[PDB]
């Protein structure tokens, strides 16, 4: 990754890494980060035009740290099954419970 901004909240190329990272080692260990069921399959019935083919896994990214459980957020990174990287989305300027690209991620 590099820097994005979601919705107006910006997060840098490492912050990016992370919670990646984090996610691949959840997913690798057939665990969820606390009582929450992240990371978990991310269908991409949108469209998004990731870089990366699927089956994809969504878990949270925030300012404050690599997600541990509690309320999510609004962000999310996406990664494909191999822990490559498919890009940041937000329900930040989206309608409902869809999600819009934050940048980059088209």
């Given at each position: 990754?590099?820097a994005?901004?979601?919705?107006?909240?910006?997060?840098?190329?490492?912050?990016?890494?992370?919670?990646?990272?984090?996610?691949?080692?959840?997913?690798?260990?057939?665990?969820?980060?606390?009582?929450?069921?992240?990371?978990?399959?991310?269908?991409?019935?949108?469209?998004?035009?990731?870089?990366?083919?699927?089956?994809?896994?969504?878990?949270?990214?925030?300012?404050?740290?690599?997600?541990?459980?509690?309320?999510?957020?609004?962000?999310?990174?996406?990664?494909?099954?191999?822990?490559?990287?498919?890009?940041?989305?937000?329900?930040?300027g989206?309608?409902?419970?869809?999600?819009?690209?934050?940048?980059?991620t088209?």
């Amino acid at each position: 990754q590099s820097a994005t901004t979601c919705g107006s909240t910006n997060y840098s190329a490492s912050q990016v890494r992370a919670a990646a990272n984090a996610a691949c080692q959840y997913y690798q260990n057939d665990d969820t980060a606390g009582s929450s069921t992240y990371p978990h399959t991310y269908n991409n019935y949108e469209g998004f035009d990731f870089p990366v083919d699927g089956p994809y896994q969504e878990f949270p990214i925030k300012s404050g740290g690599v997600y541990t459980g509690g309320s999510p957020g609004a962000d999310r990174v996406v990664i494909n099954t191999n822990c490559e990287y498919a890009g940041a989305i937000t329900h930040t300027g989206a309608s409902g419970n869809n999600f819009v690209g934050c940048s980059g991620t088209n």
